[PDB]
Amino acid sequence: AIRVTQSDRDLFKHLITEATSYVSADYMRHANERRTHLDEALALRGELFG
Amino acid sequence: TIEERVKKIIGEQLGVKQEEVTNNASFVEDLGADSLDTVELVMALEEEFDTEIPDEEAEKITTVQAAIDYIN
Amino acid sequence: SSTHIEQFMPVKLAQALANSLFPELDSQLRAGRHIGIDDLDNHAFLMDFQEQLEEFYARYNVELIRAPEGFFYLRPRST
Amino acid sequence: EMENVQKKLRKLERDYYQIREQVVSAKAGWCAVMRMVKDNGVERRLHRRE
């Protein structure tokens, strides 16, 4: 019983962790570029208005 | 036209359906656009008609009807 | 060196095929029988040499499959 | 000095226009991913703020 379940678990965990590591990283990269350019635009906007 | 160019901008800046965006559809509650999403929406509205808006008068805009009202 | 099992077959696979349990199991498997946890002998055997059996049966164009519930069975391909 | 400063203002204005266009273009593309990740994949799993 143990021998079965332990295996199953190992495979589950490895796939999950590696897939999330692979995807979330680039998703956050994109989000961060968009955040950065928006922040630059807002600073430029405020300084221009003033 | 302006009253449909506004929809063109809103749908493609928030990703919501054209049917969803009615005149009285508020961005935050109906369309779900949050702080940064609404900021980008107002920026896109500025770009489409190549105009500029004051900060306070822009932030006062929080609905499709209000959006067109300031646009038209 | 020559005349050495490794030239033709992995040692673990030959070790499995030489076991006294294999003919029974083979016969059964081919007939479509599913193998669960209760028939210890068979199940344990399967577990011990899983990959060798899989590789073996592959020759036939058939998959030796393991369901999540822990039971083994044979699934033939189109070929 | 004010005329000289109105020239810096105009440089900032041109920069601001460029940044504005770039930000809007980024959002347009990102919208598709947002509609596609409505599967409940984004709330915590993909958006790891860490």
Swiss-Prot record, chain B:
It is found in: Cytoplasm. Pathway: Lipid metabolism; fatty acid biosynthesis. One of its GO terms (molecular function) is acyl carrier activity. It comes from the Bacteria. Residues 1-72 form the Carrier domain. Changing residue 35 to A/T: Loss of phosphopantetheinylation, and inhibition of cell growth. One of its GO terms (biological process) is lipid biosynthetic process. 4'-phosphopantetheine is transferred from CoA to a specific serine of apo-ACP by AcpS. This modification is essential for activity because fatty acids are bound in thioester linkage to the sulfhydryl of the prosthetic group. Keywords: Cytoplasm, Fatty acid biosynthesis, Fatty acid metabolism, Lipid biosynthesis, Lipid metabolism, Phosphopantetheine, Phosphoprotein. Belongs to the acyl carrier protein (ACP) family. Interacts with MukB. Carrier of the growing fatty acid chain in fatty acid biosynthesis. This is Acyl carrier protein. It comes from Escherichia coli (strain K12).
